[PDB]
Amino acid sequence: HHAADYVLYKDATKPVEDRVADLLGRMTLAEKIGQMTQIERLVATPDVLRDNFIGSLLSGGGSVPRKGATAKEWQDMVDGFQKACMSTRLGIPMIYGIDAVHGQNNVYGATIFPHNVGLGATRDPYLVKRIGEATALEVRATGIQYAFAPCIAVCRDPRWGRCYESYSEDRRIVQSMTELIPGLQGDVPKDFTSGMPFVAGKNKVAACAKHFVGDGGTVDGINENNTIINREGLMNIHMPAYKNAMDKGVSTVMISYSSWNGVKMHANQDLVTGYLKDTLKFKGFVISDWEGIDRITTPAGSDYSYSVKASILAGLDMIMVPNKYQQFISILTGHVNGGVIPMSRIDDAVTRILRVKFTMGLFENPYADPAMAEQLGKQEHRDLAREAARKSLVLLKNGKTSTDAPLLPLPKKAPKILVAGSHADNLGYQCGGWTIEWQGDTGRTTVGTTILEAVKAAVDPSTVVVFAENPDAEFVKSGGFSYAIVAVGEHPYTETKGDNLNLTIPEPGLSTVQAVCGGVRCATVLISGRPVVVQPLLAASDALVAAWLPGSEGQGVTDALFGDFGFTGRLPRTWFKSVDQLPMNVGDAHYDPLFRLGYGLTTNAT
């Protein structure tokens, strides 16, 4: 179809399957194994990418071209890597992936949305779809084509350090929030076949349903550990949202570090091939987690040859190496040359990776669009995040007795008010993990509005706002305050650092709430990724709001505190009385919550 050097795979008018087949039939083994290899930007160079025919790059958490880098700097990085891939014999574009899990969260000046637990509180799948839409734009602002989201874990024990990444303990809520996928990727057409991958084009990103499967089921919420549950319960709790993701054309699936009844997921042929591929008919590509094949063995990394064999034979398509790429390629090449891994398995992996690349338009638009840089941090997206933050808030108490005046909503005009607590003026704490750094960080780490700044923006000009991080009781009682807003809670964490058997917030937190509430009527805003021991905070407070990890737009908190909007959020998880109850979910015999799933008080807008 027409010039003498026509190559069908380069013809954008041709069907995806024809282009895939045409390309695959041209590739050497080294080209094929290169497609299967994802490396960290930190080990990438132009020569590395060309010589090893690399298929994909990622930024792990905190892996950035420099601190404070602009959108244009990200595009220039990504395009520099792409130029090297495009210079190979076959010119196959790389796909660049990142954890854009509550916005484009590694990037300075990106809108940071509430973490998933708060989004579960909203019970609003359309809101979540819009968040997906905005997030795709902000990822494409930085030149990135692929986001490692959504996390569709159903967290069954809040002692898990990734509980905040789960929309709920109730899989129906998780299933509903799979609407993130067509936000990020675009809506699938009416005719669509479930399990096929889909991305609408260059203003959308490939998505990733993660982590397959039972990541939120692990014993004692120990991260990466064993999920002990029969097949009926795996299928009833942990699996259903994967079906919803297939119906919405999710492009990729990332495998869990966890084990199901003692078998590592990264080595689980029955589930990865037998179930996801052969029963759900998934036709996108399956990616490992970070050194996930290494962690098949104990100790991790102790037989990388076996890790390669076991994972590829299990049915993984792309391996997030992410550093030891020479070793990886060398080992897989030797297994193929030895007949230990059949070429059919290699060709299936490559078919899937190429299918996603062609489908999304990556061959037509391999490079960044500089006109998209202005999407990063856009005020429209911030307004969305502010709506989401406000809808996520769950009002747990609004008066000490049944006869007291409701504290909330607070009046915006008062002579003098106090804002206090470790979390009142700390943007990093309000965002939590996966924000700028992998683990999150403390203080003013990006562009956003703290609780204190939001109060100052909201109140009448005649209201004097005093900030004291940790005032003593006598300071509050002598201060002449009309009321206080006190914000306290968890510090940022991710993954294993967040695994926590006591679930008691750090001090000073409770001591500050007791000092403040002791001197003036107080509204306590609890910042956490999960339920935490709360009876003492409740005892001290006139009003208490569970604000989860609301992100960069702290005006979402004050929009409810001052009554511009009513409180509508409802608990997406059970709030335990004691950590000795755990795990404790609905249907259990010992179900005795402090607050049940679905609990939340309301107010009306003033």
Ligand SMILES: OC[C@H]1O[C@@H](S[C@H]2[C@H](O)[C@@H](O)[C@H](O[C@H]3[C@H](O)[C@@H](O)[C@H](S)O[C@@H]3CO)O[C@@H]2CO)[C@H](O)[C@@H](O)[C@@H]1O
């Ligand atoms: O990010 C891609 C997928 O990765 C894991 S999280 C992953 C972080 O992205 C990464 O920065 C981090 O690196 C640490 C290594 O694990 C350690 O071996 C060394 S000692 O220290 C570095 C410090 O950064 O590793 C993390 C996993 O351990 C998630 O599970 C996926 O959801 C995510 O999409």
